[PDB]
Short mmCIF file of C-alpha atoms in Angstrom, two decimals:
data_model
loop_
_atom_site.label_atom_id
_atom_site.label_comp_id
_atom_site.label_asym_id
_atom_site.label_seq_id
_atom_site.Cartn_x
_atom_site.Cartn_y
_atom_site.Cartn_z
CA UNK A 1 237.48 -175.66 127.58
CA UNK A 2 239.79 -176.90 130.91
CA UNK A 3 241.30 -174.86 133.70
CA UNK A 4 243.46 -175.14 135.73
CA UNK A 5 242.43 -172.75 138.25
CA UNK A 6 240.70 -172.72 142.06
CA UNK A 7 237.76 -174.36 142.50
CA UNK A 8 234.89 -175.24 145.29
CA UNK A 9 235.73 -178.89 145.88
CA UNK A 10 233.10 -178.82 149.10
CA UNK A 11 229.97 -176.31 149.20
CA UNK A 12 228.81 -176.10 152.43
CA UNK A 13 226.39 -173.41 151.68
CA UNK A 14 228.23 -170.15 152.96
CA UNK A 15 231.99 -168.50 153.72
CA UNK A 16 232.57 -172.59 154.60
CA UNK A 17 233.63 -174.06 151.75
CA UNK A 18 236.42 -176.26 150.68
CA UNK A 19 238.38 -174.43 147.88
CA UNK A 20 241.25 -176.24 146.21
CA UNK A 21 244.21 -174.09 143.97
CA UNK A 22 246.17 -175.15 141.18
CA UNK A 23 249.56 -176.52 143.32
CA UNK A 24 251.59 -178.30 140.14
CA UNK A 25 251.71 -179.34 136.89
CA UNK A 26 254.19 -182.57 137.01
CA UNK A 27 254.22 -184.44 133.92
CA UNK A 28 251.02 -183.82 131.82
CA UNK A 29 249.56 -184.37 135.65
CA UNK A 30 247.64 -180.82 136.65
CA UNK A 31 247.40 -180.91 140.83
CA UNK A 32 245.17 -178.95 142.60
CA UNK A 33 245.41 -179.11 146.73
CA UNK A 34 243.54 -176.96 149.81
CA UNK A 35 244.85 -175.45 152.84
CA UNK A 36 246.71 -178.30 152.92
CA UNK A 37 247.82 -181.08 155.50
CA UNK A 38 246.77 -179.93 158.89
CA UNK A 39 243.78 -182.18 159.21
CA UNK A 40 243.63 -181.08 156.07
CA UNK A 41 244.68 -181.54 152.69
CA UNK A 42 241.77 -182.22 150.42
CA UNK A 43 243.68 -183.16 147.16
CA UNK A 44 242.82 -183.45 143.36
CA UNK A 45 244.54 -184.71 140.33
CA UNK A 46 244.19 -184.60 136.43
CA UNK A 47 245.56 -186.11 133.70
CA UNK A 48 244.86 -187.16 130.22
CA UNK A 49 245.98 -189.22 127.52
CA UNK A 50 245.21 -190.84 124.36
CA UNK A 51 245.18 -194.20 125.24
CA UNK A 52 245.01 -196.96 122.65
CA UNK A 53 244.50 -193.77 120.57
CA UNK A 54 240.73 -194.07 119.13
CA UNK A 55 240.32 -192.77 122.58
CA UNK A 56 241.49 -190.21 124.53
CA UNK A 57 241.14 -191.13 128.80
CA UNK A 58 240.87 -188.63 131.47
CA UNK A 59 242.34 -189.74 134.68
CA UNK A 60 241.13 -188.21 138.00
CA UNK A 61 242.19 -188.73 141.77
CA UNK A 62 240.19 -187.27 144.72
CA UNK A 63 242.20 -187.33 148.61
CA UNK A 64 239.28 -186.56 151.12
CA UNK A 65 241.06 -185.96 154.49
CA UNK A 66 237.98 -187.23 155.97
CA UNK A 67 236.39 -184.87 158.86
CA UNK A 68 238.12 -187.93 160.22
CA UNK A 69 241.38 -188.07 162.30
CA UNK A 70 241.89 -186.31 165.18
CA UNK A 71 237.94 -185.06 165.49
CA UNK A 72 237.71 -188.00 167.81
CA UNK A 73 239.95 -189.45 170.16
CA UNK A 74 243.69 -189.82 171.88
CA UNK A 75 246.10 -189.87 168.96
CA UNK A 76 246.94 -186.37 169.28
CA UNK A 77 248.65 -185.75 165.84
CA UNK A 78 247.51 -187.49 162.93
CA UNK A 79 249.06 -188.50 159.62
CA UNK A 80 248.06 -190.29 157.27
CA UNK A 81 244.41 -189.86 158.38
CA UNK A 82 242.77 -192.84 157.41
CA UNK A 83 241.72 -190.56 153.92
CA UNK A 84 239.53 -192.04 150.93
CA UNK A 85 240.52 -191.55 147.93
CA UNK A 86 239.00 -191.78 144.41
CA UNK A 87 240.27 -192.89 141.44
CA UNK A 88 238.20 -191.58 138.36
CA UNK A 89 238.98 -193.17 134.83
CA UNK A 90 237.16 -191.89 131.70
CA UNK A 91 237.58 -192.80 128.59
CA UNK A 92 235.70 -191.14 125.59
CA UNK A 93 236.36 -191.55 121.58
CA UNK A 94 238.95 -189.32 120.52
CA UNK A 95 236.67 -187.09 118.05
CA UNK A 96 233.78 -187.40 120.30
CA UNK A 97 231.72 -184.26 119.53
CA UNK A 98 230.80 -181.64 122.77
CA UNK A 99 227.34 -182.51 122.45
CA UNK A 100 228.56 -186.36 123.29
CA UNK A 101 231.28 -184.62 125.55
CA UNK A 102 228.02 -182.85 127.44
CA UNK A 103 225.75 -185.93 127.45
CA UNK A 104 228.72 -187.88 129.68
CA UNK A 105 229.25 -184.95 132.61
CA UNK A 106 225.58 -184.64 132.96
CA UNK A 107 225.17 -188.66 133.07
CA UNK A 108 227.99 -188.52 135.38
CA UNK A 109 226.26 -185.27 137.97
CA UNK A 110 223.17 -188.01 136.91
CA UNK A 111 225.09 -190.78 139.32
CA UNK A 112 226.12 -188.46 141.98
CA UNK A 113 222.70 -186.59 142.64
CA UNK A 114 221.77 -186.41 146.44
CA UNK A 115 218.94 -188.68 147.02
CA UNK A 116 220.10 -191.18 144.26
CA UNK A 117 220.85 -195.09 144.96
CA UNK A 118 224.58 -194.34 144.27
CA UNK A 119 225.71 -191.55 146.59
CA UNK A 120 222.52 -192.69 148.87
CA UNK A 121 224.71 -196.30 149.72
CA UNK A 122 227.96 -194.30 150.06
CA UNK A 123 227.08 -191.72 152.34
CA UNK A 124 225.26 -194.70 154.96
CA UNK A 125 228.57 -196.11 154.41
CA UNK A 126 226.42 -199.30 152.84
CA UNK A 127 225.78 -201.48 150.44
CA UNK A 128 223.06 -201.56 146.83
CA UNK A 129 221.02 -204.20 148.04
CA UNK B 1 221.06 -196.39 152.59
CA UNK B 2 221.23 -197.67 149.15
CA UNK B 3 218.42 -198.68 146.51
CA UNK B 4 218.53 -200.70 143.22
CA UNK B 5 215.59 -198.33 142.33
CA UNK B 6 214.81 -196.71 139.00
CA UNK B 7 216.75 -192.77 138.80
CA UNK B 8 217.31 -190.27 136.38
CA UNK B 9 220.64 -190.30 135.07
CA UNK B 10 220.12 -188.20 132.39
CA UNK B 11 218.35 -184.39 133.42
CA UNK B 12 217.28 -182.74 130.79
CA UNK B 13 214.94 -180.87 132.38
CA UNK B 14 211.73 -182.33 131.21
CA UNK B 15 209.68 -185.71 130.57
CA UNK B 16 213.00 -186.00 127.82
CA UNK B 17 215.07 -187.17 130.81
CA UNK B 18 217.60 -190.66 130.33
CA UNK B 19 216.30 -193.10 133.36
CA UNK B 20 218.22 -196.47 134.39
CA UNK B 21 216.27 -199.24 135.75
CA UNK B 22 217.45 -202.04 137.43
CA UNK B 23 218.11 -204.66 135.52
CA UNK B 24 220.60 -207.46 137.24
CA UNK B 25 221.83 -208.46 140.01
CA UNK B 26 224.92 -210.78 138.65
CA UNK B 27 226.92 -211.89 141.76
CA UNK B 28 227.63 -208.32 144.25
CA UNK B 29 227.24 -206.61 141.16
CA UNK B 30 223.97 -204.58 140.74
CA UNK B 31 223.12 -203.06 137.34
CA UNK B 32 221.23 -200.66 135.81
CA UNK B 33 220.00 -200.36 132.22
CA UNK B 34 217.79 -197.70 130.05
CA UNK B 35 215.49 -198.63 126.82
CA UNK B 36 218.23 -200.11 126.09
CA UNK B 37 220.29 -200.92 122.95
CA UNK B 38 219.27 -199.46 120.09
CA UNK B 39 221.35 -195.96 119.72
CA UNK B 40 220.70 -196.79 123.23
CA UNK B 41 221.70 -198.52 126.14
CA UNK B 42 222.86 -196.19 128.73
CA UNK B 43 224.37 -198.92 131.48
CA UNK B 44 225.22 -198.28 135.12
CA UNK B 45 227.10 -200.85 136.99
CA UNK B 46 227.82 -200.66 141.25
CA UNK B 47 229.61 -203.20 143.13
CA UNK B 48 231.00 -203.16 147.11
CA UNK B 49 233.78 -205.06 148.25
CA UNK B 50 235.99 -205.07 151.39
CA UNK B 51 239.67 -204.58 149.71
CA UNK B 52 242.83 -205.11 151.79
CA UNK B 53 240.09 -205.22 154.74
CA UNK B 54 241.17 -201.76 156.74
CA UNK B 55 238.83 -199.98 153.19
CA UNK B 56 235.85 -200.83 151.37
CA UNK B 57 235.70 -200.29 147.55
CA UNK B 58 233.04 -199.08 145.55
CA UNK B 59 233.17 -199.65 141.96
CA UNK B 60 231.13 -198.06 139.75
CA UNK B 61 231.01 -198.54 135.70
CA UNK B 62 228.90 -196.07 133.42
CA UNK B 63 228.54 -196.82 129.76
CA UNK B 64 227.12 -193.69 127.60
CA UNK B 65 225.48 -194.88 124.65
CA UNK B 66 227.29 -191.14 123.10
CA UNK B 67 224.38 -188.83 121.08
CA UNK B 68 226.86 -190.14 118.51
CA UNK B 69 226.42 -193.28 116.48
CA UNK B 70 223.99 -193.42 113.34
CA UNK B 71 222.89 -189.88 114.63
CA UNK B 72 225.68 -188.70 111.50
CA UNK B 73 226.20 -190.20 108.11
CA UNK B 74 226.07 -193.51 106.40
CA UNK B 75 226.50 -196.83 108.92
CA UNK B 76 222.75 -197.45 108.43
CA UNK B 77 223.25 -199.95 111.34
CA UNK B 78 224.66 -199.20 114.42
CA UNK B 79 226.58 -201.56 117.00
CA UNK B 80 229.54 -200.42 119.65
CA UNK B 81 228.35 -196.94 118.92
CA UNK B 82 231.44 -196.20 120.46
CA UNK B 83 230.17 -195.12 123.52
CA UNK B 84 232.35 -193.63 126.27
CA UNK B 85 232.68 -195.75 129.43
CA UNK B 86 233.92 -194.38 133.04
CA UNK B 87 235.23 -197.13 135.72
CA UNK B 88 235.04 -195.43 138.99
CA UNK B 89 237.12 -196.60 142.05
CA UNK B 90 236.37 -195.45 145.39
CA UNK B 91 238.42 -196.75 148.61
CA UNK B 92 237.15 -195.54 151.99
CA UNK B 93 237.81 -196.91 155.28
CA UNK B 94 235.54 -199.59 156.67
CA UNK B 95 234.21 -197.83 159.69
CA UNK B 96 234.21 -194.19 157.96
CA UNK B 97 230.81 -192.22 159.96
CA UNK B 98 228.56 -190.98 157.25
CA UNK B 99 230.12 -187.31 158.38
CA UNK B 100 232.93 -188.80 156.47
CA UNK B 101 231.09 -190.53 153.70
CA UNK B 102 228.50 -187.43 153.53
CA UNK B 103 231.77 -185.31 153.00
CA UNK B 104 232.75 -187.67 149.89
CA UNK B 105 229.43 -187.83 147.78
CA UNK B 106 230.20 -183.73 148.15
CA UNK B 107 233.64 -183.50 147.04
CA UNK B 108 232.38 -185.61 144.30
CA UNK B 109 229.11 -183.58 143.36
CA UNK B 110 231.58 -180.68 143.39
CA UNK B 111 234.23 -182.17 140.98
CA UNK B 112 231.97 -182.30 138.75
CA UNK B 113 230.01 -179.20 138.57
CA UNK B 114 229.04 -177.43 135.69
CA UNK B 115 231.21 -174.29 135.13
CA UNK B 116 234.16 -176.89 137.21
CA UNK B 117 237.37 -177.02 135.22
CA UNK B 118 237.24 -180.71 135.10
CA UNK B 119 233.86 -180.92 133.68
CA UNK B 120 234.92 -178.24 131.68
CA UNK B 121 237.71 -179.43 130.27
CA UNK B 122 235.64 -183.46 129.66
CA UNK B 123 232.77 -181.31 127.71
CA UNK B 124 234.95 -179.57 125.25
CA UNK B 125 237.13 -183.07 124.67
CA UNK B 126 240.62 -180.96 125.75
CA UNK B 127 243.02 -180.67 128.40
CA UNK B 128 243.34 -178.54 131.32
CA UNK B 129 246.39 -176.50 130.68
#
């Protein structure tokens, strides 16, 4: 059903992970945040709303601190990092059934699948062709 | 590195799987189409562009043709099966290593797991608290 509760943002195979825990719930906007800001501070938000209501629209926003800032060099303390960030926006008929609610997370794990065109241009930082 | 190849979006554990091939390559933006159209017509869409130059932005579209449409009563004819659509927005910085952009494609794959609130949540059509 939903959540709203600690989850394994980064799996890194062992003790390692990244975990994020619920932090707020401002305004219909669930946040969910890591041992955060230190170099840190992985960050994930979740909204949703009926938009022009045939359709409901989940809204999502990832903050990757990057294993960048301050793993290099000079600028002793960081801020700001020099993050990514992810802005997620769904938007799926308002009576849509779970079976039509299951096809979309499983096209969407579909996208994202380790040696996939998708994620296989992002992580080389490049381009589709 | 990247691709414009042929990949499964759809595992369903068996030759029953939902592919995308690609089909255009309309100015930067690369898409990707399935046997397409006809309570069909699962659509994949990835474009790169430098944004305020300092980031890069990924944008990636996904249209679900929904196991819904004609697969219920009446409306012989199908058409806008109304389908579920995500528009995915990723900024990262321009000279992010692939440490960075490896970290990313995993924050992502782990949004989105399976027993995941968020995922959770999407599949049942609710909220998350």
């Amino acid at each position: 059903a939903s959540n709203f509760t600690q989850f394994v943002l980064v799996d890194n195979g062992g003790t390692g992970d990244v975990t994020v825990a619920p932090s707020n719930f401002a305004n219909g906007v669930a946040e969910w945040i890591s041992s955060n800001s230190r170099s840190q501070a992985y960050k994930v938000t979740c909204s949703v709303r009926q938009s022009s209501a045939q359709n409901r629209k989940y809204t999502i926003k990832v903050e990757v601190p990057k294993v960048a800032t301050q793993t290099v060099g000079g600028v002793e303390l960081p801020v700001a990092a020099r993050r990514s960030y992810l802005n997620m926006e769904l938007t799926i008929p308002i009576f849509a059934t779970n079976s039509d609610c299951e096809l979309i997370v499983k096209a969407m794990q579909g996208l994202l699948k380790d040696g996939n065109p998708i994620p296989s241009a992002i992580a080389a930082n490049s381009g589709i062709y």
